[PDB]
Structures are given as C-alpha cells and as structure tokens.
UniProtKB/Swiss-Prot annotation:
Expressing tissues: Overexpressed in gastrointestinal cancers; expression correlates with later tumor-node-metastasis stages of colorectal cancers.
Function: GTPase which can activate the MEK/ERK pathway and induce cell transformation when overexpressed. May act as a nuclear scaffold for MAPK1, probably by association with MAPK1 nuclear export signal leading to enhanced ERK1/ERK2 signaling.
Subunit text: Interacts directly with MAPK1 (wild-type and kinase-deficient forms). Interacts directly (in GTP-bound form) with MAP2K1 (wild-type and kinase-deficient forms).
Location of the protein in the cell: Nucleus
Primary gene name: DNAJC27
Protein's UniProt name: DnaJ homolog subfamily C member 27
Note: DNAJC27/RBJ knockdown in several colorectal cancer cell lines is correlated to inhibition of MEK/ERK activation, cell proliferation, colony formation and in vivo tumor growth.
Organism field: Homo sapiens (Human)
Parent-protein start and end of this portion: 197 to 273 of 273
The organism's place on the tree of life at top rank: Eukaryota
Family in the record: Belongs to the small GTPase superfamily. Rab family.
Domain (J): residue spans on this chain: 28-84
Disulfide bond sites: none
Length: 90
C-alpha cells in the first residue's frame, strides 16, 4: 500500500518553512544544506547540523519538516561520500 499523514495544523516560523521550501525545490545537495560544492566534511556537517535542528521533528512540528529532514540526510551523507578525494580503501 501507501503511507499517508494529514497535517491540517501548521505552526512554525519563517526560517523553518523557508527551509522545507528550499529543500523540496532544491536542485542539489549544496542548495539544501546551503553550502558550496567545494566545502569539506566539517563544513557539510556544520550546515547539516544547524539545519537538522531546525527541520528536526522535535523543533518543527510542520507537516513538511519531516520530509525536509529526510532530504538533508540524503544530501549530506551523499556529498560526504564524494568529499573523499583519494580512495582510502580498495
């Protein structure tokens, strides 16, 4: 089947909304996290952290805050993998 949830109620700040709006309308991970394509693991994580807290399901009860948080992960986690310049293992 398919999962579905109703979020009739929506209470949050501009910052949050703006986040979920950008993520859902992001063309890449850099845009989501809000960093440059030439940043380091420390950077990507920094942006992912600050954001995560904002999109966190414990801070943002928004109906989209959930989806947003999910995107971030796929973004950061992915980017990081690329961050690696040389193949450590193999």
């Amino acid at each position: 089947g398919s999962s579905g949830s109703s979020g009739s109620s929506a209470s949050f700040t501009k910052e949050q909304a703006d986040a979920i709006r950008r993520i859902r309308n992001s063309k890449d991970s850099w845009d989501m996290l809000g960093v440059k394509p030439g940043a380091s693991r420390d950077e990507v994580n920094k942006a992912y952290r600050k954001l995560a807290v904002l999109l966190h399901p414990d801070k943002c009860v928004a109906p989209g805050s959930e989806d947003a948080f999910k995107a971030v992960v796929n973004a950061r986690t992915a980017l990081l993998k690329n961050i690696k310049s040389g193949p450590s293992s193999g």
